[PDB]
Amino acid sequence: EQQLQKEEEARKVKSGIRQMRLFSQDECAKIEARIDEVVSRAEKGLYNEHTVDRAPLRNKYFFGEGYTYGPGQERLYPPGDVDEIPEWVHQLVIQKLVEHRVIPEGFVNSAVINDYQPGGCIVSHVDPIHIFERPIVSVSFFSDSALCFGCKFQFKPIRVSEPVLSLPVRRGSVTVLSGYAADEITHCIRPQDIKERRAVIILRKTRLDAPRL
Ligand SMILES: O=C(O)CCC(=O)C(=O)O
Ligand SMILES: [Mn+2]
After folding, report:
1. Considering the domain 1-213, what is its CATH architecture?
2. CB of 199 shorter than 6 A to ligand 1
3. Which of 86, 94, 119, 184 is deepest in the core (most CB within 10 A)?
4. Closest-approaching ligand to the CA atom of 181
5. What does the alpha-carbon distance between residue 82 and residue 48 come to, in Å, rounded to a whole number?
6. How do the domains of the chain map onto residue ranges?
7. d(CA 213, CA 210)
8. Are 91 and 35 in contact (CB under 8 A)?
């Protein structure tokens, strides 16, 4: 069988991935406390309708900009519909990324927190190309996990038992997605890779021509 094709694809995906450990135990602890605060405030109904997206395995919290249901016709909510990026995100997360030249100042106009229960997951998807610019930066928080690329296995486990690549994502680590890894392949999380609670902050810039609702 041609498993050289799988090695070619994995190499192409590797080239769109950069990773650095940026946040110490203490820094992570402080951000985690704030994440916990977002969850509490969401339970209290303190956010706009489109800020919070509650689902069985995973909750998402949209700040700055957000979007609708996503076959692939995601739309951007009008200004004011989602809550603004909280100051602690600017101070504790974004600043540290700018200070380490991960992304430039003023790039980030969208912050999304994904909160996973054990056994939570993400189904195969590409980050909406018509909505977000690249690179796509994310920071992992409560525990360690794995990000998979080439997620055909979620649907055809007999034909292909495995992802093209699995990327470890440690607590306090920064993942940057671009090129092939962001545009040419899907990613996902396997339920089994989420043993304990895990949250992630995803920092992006929305496109200027992003279709609006
Ligand atoms: O949970 C992660 O590390 C990736 C998040 C993700 O794929 C998304 O919400 O778009
Ligand atoms: Mn994604």
Report:
1. Sandwich (2.60)
2. no
3. 94
4. 2
5. 6
6. 1-213
7. 10
8. no
